Amino acid sequence: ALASTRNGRDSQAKRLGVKRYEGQVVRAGNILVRQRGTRFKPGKNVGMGRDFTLFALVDGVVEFQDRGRLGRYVHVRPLA
Amino acid sequence: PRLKVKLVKSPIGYPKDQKAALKALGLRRLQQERVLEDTPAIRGNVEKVAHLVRVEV
Amino acid sequence: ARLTAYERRKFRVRNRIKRTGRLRLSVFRSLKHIYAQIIDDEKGVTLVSASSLALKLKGNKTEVARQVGRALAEKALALGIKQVAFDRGPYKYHGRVKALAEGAREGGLEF
Amino acid sequence: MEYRLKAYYREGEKPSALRRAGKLPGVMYNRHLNRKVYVDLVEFDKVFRQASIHHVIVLELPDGQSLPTLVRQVNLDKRRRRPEHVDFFVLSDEPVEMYVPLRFVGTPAGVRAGGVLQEIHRDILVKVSPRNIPEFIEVDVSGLEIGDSLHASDLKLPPGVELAVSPEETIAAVV
Amino acid sequence: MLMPRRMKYRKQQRGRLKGATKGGDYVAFGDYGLVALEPAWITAQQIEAARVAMVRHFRRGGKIFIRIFPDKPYTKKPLEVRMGKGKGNYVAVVKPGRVMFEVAGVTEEQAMEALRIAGHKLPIKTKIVRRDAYDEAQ
RNA sequence: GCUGACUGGGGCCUGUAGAGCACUGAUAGGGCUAGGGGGCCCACCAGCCUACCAAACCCUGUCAAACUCCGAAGGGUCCCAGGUGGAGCCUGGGAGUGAGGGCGCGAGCGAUAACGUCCGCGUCCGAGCGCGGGAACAACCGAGACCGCCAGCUAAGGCCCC
RNA sequence: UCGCCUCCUAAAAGGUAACGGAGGCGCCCAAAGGUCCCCUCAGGCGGGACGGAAAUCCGCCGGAGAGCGCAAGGGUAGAAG
RNA sequence: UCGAUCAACGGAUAAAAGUUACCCCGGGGAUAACAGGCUGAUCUCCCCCGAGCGUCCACAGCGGCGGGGAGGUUUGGCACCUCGAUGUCGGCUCGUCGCAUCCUGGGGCUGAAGAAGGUCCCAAGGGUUGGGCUGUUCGCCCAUUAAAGCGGCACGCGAGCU
RNA sequence: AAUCCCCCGUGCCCAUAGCGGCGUGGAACCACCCGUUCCCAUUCCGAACACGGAAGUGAAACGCGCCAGCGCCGAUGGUACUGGGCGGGCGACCGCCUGGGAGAGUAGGUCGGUGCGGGGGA
Ligand SMILES: [Mg+2]
Ligand SMILES: [Mg+2]
Ligand SMILES: [Mg+2]
Ligand SMILES: [Mg+2]
Ligand SMILES: [Mg+2]
Ligand SMILES: [Mg+2]
Ligand SMILES: [Mg+2]
Ligand SMILES: [Mg+2]
Ligand SMILES: [Mg+2]
Ligand SMILES: [Mg+2]
Ligand SMILES: [Mg+2]
Ligand SMILES: [Mg+2]
Ligand SMILES: [Mg+2]
Ligand SMILES: [Mg+2]
Ligand SMILES: [Mg+2]
Ligand SMILES: [Mg+2]
Ligand SMILES: [Mg+2]
Ligand SMILES: [Mg+2]
Ligand SMILES: [Mg+2]
Ligand SMILES: [Mg+2]
Ligand SMILES: [Mg+2]
Ligand SMILES: [Mg+2]
Ligand SMILES: [Mg+2]
Ligand SMILES: [Mg+2]
Ligand SMILES: [Mg+2]
Ligand SMILES: [Mg+2]
Ligand SMILES: [Mg+2]
Ligand SMILES: [Mg+2]
Ligand SMILES: [Mg+2]
Ligand SMILES: [Mg+2]
Ligand SMILES: [Mg+2]
Ligand SMILES: [Mg+2]
Ligand SMILES: [Mg+2]
Ligand SMILES: [Mg+2]
Ligand SMILES: [Mg+2]
Ligand SMILES: [Mg+2]
Ligand SMILES: [Mg+2]
Ligand SMILES: [Mg+2]
Ligand SMILES: [Mg+2]
Ligand SMILES: [Mg+2]
Ligand SMILES: [Mg+2]
Ligand SMILES: [Mg+2]
Ligand SMILES: [Mg+2]
Ligand SMILES: [Mg+2]
Ligand SMILES: [Mg+2]
Ligand SMILES: [Mg+2]
Ligand SMILES: [Mg+2]
Ligand SMILES: [Mg+2]
Ligand SMILES: [Mg+2]
Ligand SMILES: [Mg+2]
Ligand SMILES: [Mg+2]
Ligand SMILES: [Mg+2]
Ligand SMILES: [Mg+2]
Ligand SMILES: [Mg+2]
Ligand SMILES: [Mg+2]
Ligand SMILES: [Mg+2]
Ligand SMILES: [Mg+2]
Ligand SMILES: [Mg+2]
Ligand SMILES: [Mg+2]
Ligand SMILES: [Mg+2]
Ligand SMILES: [Mg+2]
Ligand SMILES: [Mg+2]
Ligand SMILES: [Mg+2]
Ligand SMILES: [Mg+2]
Ligand SMILES: [Mg+2]
Ligand SMILES: [Mg+2]
Ligand SMILES: [Mg+2]
Ligand SMILES: [Mg+2]
Ligand SMILES: [Mg+2]
Ligand SMILES: [Mg+2]
Ligand SMILES: [Mg+2]
Ligand SMILES: [Mg+2]
Ligand SMILES: [Mg+2]
Ligand SMILES: [Mg+2]
Ligand SMILES: [Mg+2]
Ligand SMILES: [Mg+2]
Ligand SMILES: [Mg+2]
Ligand SMILES: [Mg+2]
Ligand SMILES: [Mg+2]
Ligand SMILES: [Mg+2]
Ligand SMILES: [Mg+2]
Ligand SMILES: [Mg+2]
Ligand SMILES: [Mg+2]
Ligand SMILES: [Mg+2]
Ligand SMILES: [Mg+2]
Ligand SMILES: [Mg+2]
Ligand SMILES: [Mg+2]
Ligand SMILES: [Mg+2]
Ligand SMILES: [Mg+2]
Ligand SMILES: [Mg+2]
Ligand SMILES: [Mg+2]
């Protein structure tokens, strides 16, 4: 309807974002980024799960890469 | 060399990190003079609280 | 029309290959010749080379191709290289490009 | 007809102070130079009411050189609407774009006294070699009738130099 | 009256009156301006009050520019208390140093005595201005 | 058992303030122009004039929580240092609390009302109705009361008399 | 009005209230799924029988405004279409 | 692997609607109705501007559209003391104060000949009737009058009455 | 063999590499080109993809230059805003200190740069 109130909803926050930043040490499996579209693409030693979710493939440290119109990139550098 | 930091004004009513700071200079009561090295970390806290304690070299 | 069919399928197959992260056995083929170049990316660097040009052979372009494959294996295997992935570029795996690849086993392989 | 002001230099000396001081921060530049300068506000004002990015201002300043500037920016701060700072462009001989005022000459010249006059531009932007700078532009066009839009090159083009265009736009009309 | 057609959203949050006019402010169309010394929500009905005072002031003659527009919807409840928002019931946000109004094609002594009337219809203090070098070229 | 708040350096994350108009929308003045509002000459396709309608388009000029070509200060997190503190982490025993309030800043609701209401970050009262200033006054300024002193220096605020 | 999703509020990490502002879900698809191979939009202008603002065809221009089963967001043609 | 609008969607039972002015207990000023308080949208009264009407027009008398305030008498907002009780409308009795003045006194202007009015200024000393109707306050009406004023005091006043 | 230059691949920076105009290149690379027997093709078409070729052409495409009309990049100075510290205003809001500091815009910039490998000249 109009007045009484037709509004009132909202959904739960999804706690989305970057979970490991540059030069943080990770282990195989650690998810690195939680995100909706392809907003960061998977890099070197980095997986992407069906919900667009990026994880470390290998132990290591995380480096961020901005490739211009190729988008932004997350890799894991071994010395695992 | 080293700085002489003395508490001249009460921290009552200033944000908690401003109080946390005087613990890093380990200043507790008022008037308290303290003598510590001039290095950038010890200088950071001294600056943060500069509206309370007065400094000298 | 921007960015042609050629350059799309071009990128398409490279990108897929480039993920698995092997050494890349890339294949250019002109209407006259057929060349093949084994690359390591992340160093952006070529390792082994083979051409119908620098080998100066001719007649039956396919048969010429099988040769520049064996030519590559032989030179390549000599540096330790055994496993790689076949780039196949913007070319149907068929004919001349097929032939160089099936001439590139006997030597480093899985094609 | 011809204008000069003064100018001084500065390095430190926070703008707020200078501005309290009756003076007026600004900068001097061109392809070969960029330099920090100030002027007197009350002095500058008298000149600029006249010159107004239309005529050339020759500065002065110490050394004493005398520098052939065009004023290419004035930031007035919006609350008090009064200049907070000034851009002084120094000329050398290479063509440079700029704004020439416009002399509308005639009577309404057809439909006289009259339709409505409607001047759509008091200026035009034109590329000009500094040496010859056409201090105004007589535009008559006694054709001057109801409804038309004169474009650009239908202007006199005082001898020196060409438009910074666009060749097709709206200068005036009557209705 | 003055009002948009077509809005994306019917109601919209109040927000602040913080700052200086941020554009508008330099006297672009006319010989004389009326400039805002204070912030305020100026109402479609105050604007039209001022516009008419001026045309009435000269001859049906002259030319008038306005140049602020009431695109911000202004809600009010009835004498109720609290359940939802709404309703109804338009303003233009106006910070200091903005040119509203701004006449042309009239004698200075006309424009100025009309702009004086005009600002008597406004919730804020105002300033009459003329035109300048300072209003540049563009 | 040195890892703590806080702080220095370095990296990465972000889309607010401000601003902008490239998107989505709104939007003032002018120009040029589709369709026509049909003045009409038709009442054959025609068909021209528009101080009315008008897309887009150009020029000037603006506005936006659910617009963004841009975008600070700050904020988060990790590394390396300082930092021995009624600091920190681990296991376990005992709780109480789950009516908060004022004020400052940033928002929403409200009427650019409320000693209004609802969140955010701080603070103080709560529990500092102990002390000094503000005439008097929880929360504004000053300041964290272990005991004693017929000694000194100051804070805020004050220095004509009370 | 009550659970779930999208946006804003939300003060550039996460999180964050109100009988604050706006919308959606309670399904669907044996192909709308897996893989290999190929292909690239919408729009505009010009040309073309029946064809009209639009059916199909041909040319040029068109980096994505289209599409991605449905709301919104993010994403996306170097594909997710 | 199936049976859930267990949708009040962390889902009391397999199984459930109303009424109480005939009501009761435990609590709450955590929460409504009265009054006060904050607020002042609404209300009453000023003031700015000044299109315009007024033959003409200095606004004699009016005053559109808009703007700024004052007062705290209305209707409300809020929910702050009071629910281990602050008795509620109206009348009667008894007043007292405010002044935004109903009359009387003194003024200016007038579209004031006189008389009589209009409007605004000063002024709170005193005065400000009796009746029909209705619980009424208000209001209407009759007959008079110098006039038949508007408010505040817990909509003054129930340990004073009704 | 290094060095340089041209071509061909193929990376990288991610428009200062872009659009448009102009000019230039076929020996060699490359392309278009000759054909459709064969492998393989077209919801029709050897257009595309594919093969077997080598007569011609640098027209298209591609490469290399040069033009600043567009596009893209873009200071310095000054403001806005602001961490932290203080004031002022009934309010809306405003100012000072210290530290950080845009966006628009102005001056300019730009018709790319570069790694590995080949082929050819040096
Ligand atoms: Mg959400
Ligand atoms: Mg204090
Ligand atoms: Mg902190
Ligand atoms: Mg602007
Ligand atoms: Mg209002
Ligand atoms: Mg209620
Ligand atoms: Mg005013
Ligand atoms: Mg330590
Ligand atoms: Mg950091
Ligand atoms: Mg903003
Ligand atoms: Mg826009
Ligand atoms: Mg915004
Ligand atoms: Mg930038
Ligand atoms: Mg340490
Ligand atoms: Mg503890
Ligand atoms: Mg415990
Ligand atoms: Mg509870
Ligand atoms: Mg609670
Ligand atoms: Mg609370
Ligand atoms: Mg303040
Ligand atoms: Mg409260
Ligand atoms: Mg409040
Ligand atoms: Mg609090
Ligand atoms: Mg308590
Ligand atoms: Mg405490
Ligand atoms: Mg007390
Ligand atoms: Mg006290
Ligand atoms: Mg006292
Ligand atoms: Mg006291
Ligand atoms: Mg106290
Ligand atoms: Mg103590
Ligand atoms: Mg005193
Ligand atoms: Mg958004
Ligand atoms: Mg957030
Ligand atoms: Mg935040
Ligand atoms: Mg956040
Ligand atoms: Mg619904
Ligand atoms: Mg099309
Ligand atoms: Mg067509
Ligand atoms: Mg899309
Ligand atoms: Mg969507
Ligand atoms: Mg969608
Ligand atoms: Mg989307
Ligand atoms: Mg339930
Ligand atoms: Mg529940
Ligand atoms: Mg839940
Ligand atoms: Mg059950
Ligand atoms: Mg019962
Ligand atoms: Mg009963
Ligand atoms: Mg009984
Ligand atoms: Mg009973
Ligand atoms: Mg009881
Ligand atoms: Mg009472
Ligand atoms: Mg009450
Ligand atoms: Mg009381
Ligand atoms: Mg009031
Ligand atoms: Mg009041
Ligand atoms: Mg008044
Ligand atoms: Mg009340
Ligand atoms: Mg209460
Ligand atoms: Mg409360
Ligand atoms: Mg009670
Ligand atoms: Mg009692
Ligand atoms: Mg009384
Ligand atoms: Mg009086
Ligand atoms: Mg009298
Ligand atoms: Mg009298
Ligand atoms: Mg009189
Ligand atoms: Mg008389
Ligand atoms: Mg009296
Ligand atoms: Mg009386
Ligand atoms: Mg009787
Ligand atoms: Mg009776
Ligand atoms: Mg009645
Ligand atoms: Mg009576
Ligand atoms: Mg009452
Ligand atoms: Mg009473
Ligand atoms: Mg009684
Ligand atoms: Mg009593
Ligand atoms: Mg009593
Ligand atoms: Mg770009
Ligand atoms: Mg040739
Ligand atoms: Mg030749
Ligand atoms: Mg050519
Ligand atoms: Mg720029
Ligand atoms: Mg700068
Ligand atoms: Mg500050
Ligand atoms: Mg900049
Ligand atoms: Mg270029
Ligand atoms: Mg290269
Ligand atoms: Mg070479």
PDB file of C-alpha atoms (C1' of nucleotides) in Angstrom, chain B residues 8-17 19-21 23-24 28 30 37 40-45 48, chain F residues 4-9 75 81-87 121-125 141-144 154-155:
ATOM      1  CA  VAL B   8      50.255  20.447  32.444  1.00  0.00           C
ATOM      2  CA  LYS B   9      46.553  19.770  31.787  1.00  0.00           C
ATOM      3  CA  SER B  10      44.141  17.071  32.760  1.00  0.00           C
ATOM      4  CA  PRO B  11      43.230  14.183  30.303  1.00  0.00           C
ATOM      5  CA  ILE B  12      39.859  13.931  31.974  1.00  0.00           C
ATOM      6  CA  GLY B  13      37.385  14.198  29.146  1.00  0.00           C
ATOM      7  CA  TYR B  14      39.762  13.590  26.236  1.00  0.00           C
ATOM      8  CA  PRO B  15      39.444  10.534  24.037  1.00  0.00           C
ATOM      9  CA  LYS B  16      40.746   7.239  25.347  1.00  0.00           C
ATOM     10  CA  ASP B  17      43.600   6.950  22.848  1.00  0.00           C
ATOM     11  CA  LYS B  19      44.935   8.796  27.549  1.00  0.00           C
ATOM     12  CA  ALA B  20      46.493   5.591  26.230  1.00  0.00           C
ATOM     13  CA  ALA B  21      49.296   7.822  24.915  1.00  0.00           C
ATOM     14  CA  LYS B  23      50.793   5.598  29.410  1.00  0.00           C
ATOM     15  CA  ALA B  24      53.301   5.145  26.587  1.00  0.00           C
ATOM     16  CA  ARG B  28      50.721   9.326  35.439  1.00  0.00           C
ATOM     17  CA  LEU B  30      50.022  15.950  36.819  1.00  0.00           C
ATOM     18  CA  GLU B  37      64.782   9.948  23.916  1.00  0.00           C
ATOM     19  CA  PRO B  40      59.992   9.265  16.012  1.00  0.00           C
ATOM     20  CA  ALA B  41      57.729   6.799  18.007  1.00  0.00           C
ATOM     21  CA  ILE B  42      58.217   8.476  21.365  1.00  0.00           C
ATOM     22  CA  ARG B  43      57.703  11.741  19.433  1.00  0.00           C
ATOM     23  CA  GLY B  44      54.387  10.569  17.975  1.00  0.00           C
ATOM     24  CA  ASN B  45      52.828  10.166  21.374  1.00  0.00           C
ATOM     25  CA  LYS B  48      49.294  13.478  20.100  1.00  0.00           C
TER      26      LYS B  48
ATOM     27  C1'   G F   4      49.090  -4.829  25.145  1.00  0.00           C
ATOM     28  C1'   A F   5      46.506   0.052  24.366  1.00  0.00           C
ATOM     29  C1'   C F   6      48.910   4.077  22.164  1.00  0.00           C
ATOM     30  C1'   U F   7      52.937   5.579  18.796  1.00  0.00           C
ATOM     31  C1'   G F   8      56.977   5.666  14.015  1.00  0.00           C
ATOM     32  C1'   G F   9      57.904   3.507   9.200  1.00  0.00           C
ATOM     33  C1'   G F  75      39.723   4.662   9.104  1.00  0.00           C
ATOM     34  C1'   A F  81      60.438  -1.161  15.664  1.00  0.00           C
ATOM     35  C1'   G F  82      59.266   1.596  20.498  1.00  0.00           C
ATOM     36  C1'   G F  83      55.975   0.752  24.391  1.00  0.00           C
ATOM     37  C1'   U F  84      56.974  -3.669  31.833  1.00  0.00           C
ATOM     38  C1'   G F  85      51.442  -1.654  31.801  1.00  0.00           C
ATOM     39  C1'   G F  86      45.894  -2.941  37.816  1.00  0.00           C
ATOM     40  C1'   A F  87      49.144  -4.178  29.979  1.00  0.00           C
ATOM     41  C1'   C F 121      32.081   8.006  17.034  1.00  0.00           C
ATOM     42  C1'   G F 122      33.673  10.436  21.535  1.00  0.00           C
ATOM     43  C1'   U F 123      33.102  12.019  26.352  1.00  0.00           C
ATOM     44  C1'   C F 124      31.273  12.765  31.239  1.00  0.00           C
ATOM     45  C1'   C F 125      27.066  11.594  35.056  1.00  0.00           C
ATOM     46  C1'   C F 141      35.030  24.963  32.431  1.00  0.00           C
ATOM     47  C1'   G F 142      38.887  23.306  36.143  1.00  0.00           C
ATOM     48  C1'   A F 143      40.296  18.864  38.458  1.00  0.00           C
ATOM     49  C1'   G F 144      40.443  12.157  39.416  1.00  0.00           C
ATOM     50  C1'   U F 154      48.774  26.864  40.412  1.00  0.00           C
ATOM     51  C1'   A F 155      44.003  25.442  37.244  1.00  0.00           C
TER      52        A F 155
END
